Amino acid sequence: MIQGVIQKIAGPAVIAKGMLGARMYDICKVGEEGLVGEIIRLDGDTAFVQVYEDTSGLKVGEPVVSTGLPLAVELGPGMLNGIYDGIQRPLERIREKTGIYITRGVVVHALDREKKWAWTPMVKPGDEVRGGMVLGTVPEFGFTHKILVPPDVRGRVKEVKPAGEYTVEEPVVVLEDGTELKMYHTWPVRRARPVQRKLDPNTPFLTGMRILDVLFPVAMGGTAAIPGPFGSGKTVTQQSLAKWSNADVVVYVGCGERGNEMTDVLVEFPELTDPKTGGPLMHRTVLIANTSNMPVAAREASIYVGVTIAEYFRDQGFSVALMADSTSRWAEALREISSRLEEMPAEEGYPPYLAARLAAFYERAGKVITLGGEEGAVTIVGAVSPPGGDMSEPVTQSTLRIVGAFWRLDASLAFRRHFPAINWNGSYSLFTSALDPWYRENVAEDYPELRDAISELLQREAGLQEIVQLVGPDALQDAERLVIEVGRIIREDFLQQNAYHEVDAYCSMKKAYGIMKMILAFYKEAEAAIKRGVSIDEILQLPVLERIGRARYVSEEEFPAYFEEAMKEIQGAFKALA
Amino acid sequence: RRVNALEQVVIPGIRAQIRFIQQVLEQREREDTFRLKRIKGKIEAREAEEE
Amino acid sequence: DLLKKEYTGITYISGPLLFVENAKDLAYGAIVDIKDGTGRVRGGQVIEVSEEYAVIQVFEETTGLDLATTSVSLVEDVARLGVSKEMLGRRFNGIGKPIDGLPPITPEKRLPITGLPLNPVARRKPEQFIQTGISTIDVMNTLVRGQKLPIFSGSGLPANEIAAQIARQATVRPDLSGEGEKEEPFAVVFAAMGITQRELSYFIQEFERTGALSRSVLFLNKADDPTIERILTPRMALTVAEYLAFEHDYHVLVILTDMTNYCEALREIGAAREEIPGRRGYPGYMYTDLATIYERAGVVEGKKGSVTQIPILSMPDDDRTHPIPDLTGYITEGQIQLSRELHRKGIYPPIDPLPSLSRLMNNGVGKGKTREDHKQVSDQLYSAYANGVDIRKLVAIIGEDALTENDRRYLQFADAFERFFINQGQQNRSIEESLQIAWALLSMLPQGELKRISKDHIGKYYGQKLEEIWG
Amino acid sequence: DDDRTHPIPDLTGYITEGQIQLSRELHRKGIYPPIDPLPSLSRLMNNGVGKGKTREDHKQVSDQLYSAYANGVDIRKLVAIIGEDALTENDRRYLQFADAFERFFINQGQQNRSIEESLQIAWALLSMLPQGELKRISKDHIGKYYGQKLEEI
């Protein structure tokens, strides 16, 4: 291999001379310790290497060895129920080897080479195999893991291992040209995995939140962005999505965030229940952790590793949801790397190619037809952290041009403890018109009409709030007072949701439909009562208002009995007066 | 009522916008000063140090 | 010649640039082949040549390149594209290669993609008015055949749907202009730069539903495609459009999906070459670069063909003073600006009439072309809408209960205008229907206040009721 | 300045787990310490309160105090532009609660109040409102802690 020596050290940047023949974006071993590095610039006899670990203590003259391969991850059984480093290293072995502190130079295999896996063959000798075909099955925590041909391999089957227990590195299928296929394969993280076709998303991604499932839906295979200042509620929303969504596999990427938030997932999740399989919740979740005090250059690799794992699980027919904690930290890492290269900066010091990377990252999502023939989808939700809440910053503006949903948070609502604090006036969703055929047969035929009525009521309340604060509430007529009060009722009882309450944390679609029906029925009855001369104070002091407010705390099993009685209660209460 | 509204609403709203615009212009001036430094460094190198 | 010399001796690879030392024989602007050690061939273009070394920009990514095995060979001195009449109905990528599985085009001619400036003596005035079926465009911002009319959009605004509706409903009116002869359908040239799958699927389905693929040529450059390839796509699209229009008398309509992506691609090369920046880091030659794209449309004296452009671009923070819309507005002949406030109220299409402008409106309207009362009605509508918008800001401060009757009339006229004229849905209104609605809305105002309209037209058209049109 | 968006407190906010903000308005009128409960936040509070540590009624009392103080601040700031002509009896009760709250609970001075006497003062302030207004508290904790008088007079 190509071997050289260090001739310049400056921060996370190492320049190695004598590296003629090295290729762009390859993986190198830097120094006598063996730090992992990547080549990003070639200049004559020297090469420019960025280092994914701490460079303190290195001396000029240490050897540099190039592996001749780009950055790749090991894809196979054993990735579920695991916590990984930014360059795909299991942290539970790092703790065993080094203790409570993370130290550089530790080399650990990504997949366990000692665990035995039950093997059930599917192919036979003499068969013809192509990329993405299934040649066997391996059991997992309720899932059936499929061993897939690598996408760039073609040939004919020569022999098949019989049924039994083997490790991941034992060959199971040998091709007629001499190629030996194991239970795992390696794939470069910077290359998108091939697919046959892409399909239009037409099924909803149920998040469990009322305001996101009703007002601003996101389809299976779409993309969404959630910006907001600190303390707005991005992490709580992402963790609630991880807990309560209907996706088969959830991949969580923590890029440059707190370590306590990652420890919370490691502690709480093994004791929870999977919404659809009935097992432990951690059995379907993969964690990639790179905290803020960890080396900066590993932030870029973690996003690619997570999206590559999500693409790999997509090819098996599963439905994968990918959550990124913050892309602003990735932008900061790119800015630091470009500053070490002394390149010309764009606005706010970011490199000019920042938008291309974000476009190439969000493009990997979508519902596809796999090479094997199954159907899978990947949905990406990425949180953005503008500095002062200024959403004119380049990262937010580059993100808004490719995403299909925009969940804008407000610092004004977060200070008054109104959650999830979604600014319903600035938010939008482009997937609403495509999910209406699904809603019309899976929930109710009149669901879009009720949603439009609720939106119109919110718009009218927002319009009247200017007159309310510029003339005073006393100058308003009773008809406008009714609209103001109904808007307040809607805001307090439907949009607001508690993520820590034992019942209110999850809400089905039919429960939200029933709440909307109750609110609209109350509004219609109160509107009818106004023409009959009933005072607005008599309407507001009715005890049926508390029944609507307490409706969101009712469990799913008891809710239909609550709704059936509450409708008659509303009708009788408005019948008994005047 | 009009005096109270003008005193407590409009004036801080204008003042914050003024401060924001001043900060943006200051940042732009610093960013162009950095580019001028870089191009002066480039000019000083190729005209004296090269053979 | 039939053979080419391979230039070994690459000494610098970083970003999109590549340096070669022994390349004094390469012409400026030539296209080269970059051969990887594994046999893969990538494209490139020379941007600076000297007796010491040459500078080459790379279209594809630089992954896998090394300084030992990579070699550079010349393709041609001038970048050329083979064009033919048989390429209608085909699909190509951003560099002119087929992606539909059909065999490549047999070229009738090869033309330089950089183009040549049109002689101002050889031009002629655009005269034929185009009925797009939208009242806010037909009446107030009239589009003529041969005009450049970009659409100013935002992040969530539906510019693509408006462009598709315009391309679906565009037709000229020979009966009004007295020509008589039935027009041929427009030939559509579609160029996409950094488009996503969500918009591309919508465009493909809309074109397949209307059967326009038999008359369309598509150049597609997706978001996952290399960024540097976006430089050549508009030039190839415009070369094909100009060839079809001025060699075979076609009427060509050209749609560009996002010029913001083209500017972002240009900024990378500008920053890599250490050029003097503009106001927000964009290169100082961006005005000249954009001018070579827009100015290729128009009409030619003594020829039947025409080129019409409808570019689409997104203002980042809904900002009209951003460098890209600012430089676009100085080159084109108008703009159509969408409004987010109208979009939030359910109005479709959300075209804002006041920021919109059509510079070539006066050529295609008047007696003998559409009607004698077009321009005066348009001006009166503009003035009345401006008065209503100004009165809204007054009632936002003093309250609506202190208004006079005239201010209340203007305030009601503004709401009626927004609810009836702008908001039309998917229907295809003719010019006569739009003028009827415009005269119905003007009837709400007192007759004496119509200062900009002559009394001869007032005595003929005033007095229409709106309830006879909408119930 | 009042600039919450200055880079230093902004970058401090993205790393830490909450903040305690001092108010200049409370400092001007003599309240010590001038801690403003509305922009303050503690993200890890939910793990450290409950049964077995402190007292089992900590979270309910905290939520009720926050709700009542927020209502009192809303009532107080409604008057400052339009006038005091729209107050009802309940609004005056919440205004009196806010006044006594800023007088006693926040304005503790250089004392060394324990958690037990702090909860005692909090319950003494909660006794100024009717039991029907205390929506956030379960009625079990009301039955065994309601009825305290103002101890700091």
Ligand SMILES: Nc1ncnc2c1ncn2[C@@H]1O[C@H](COP(=O)(O)OP(=O)(O)OP(=O)(O)O)[C@@H](O)[C@H]1O
């Ligand atoms: N849906 C919710 N229900 C209840 N409380 C919530 C909700 N969302 C946020 N909170 C509260 O607000 C706090 C916000 O913390 P969170 O980690 O969600 O913020 P963030 O937007 O990720 O900020 P940061 O940028 O500082 O990481 C939570 O710790 C919790 O106390």
Ligand SMILES: [Mg+2]
């Ligand atoms: Mg967070």
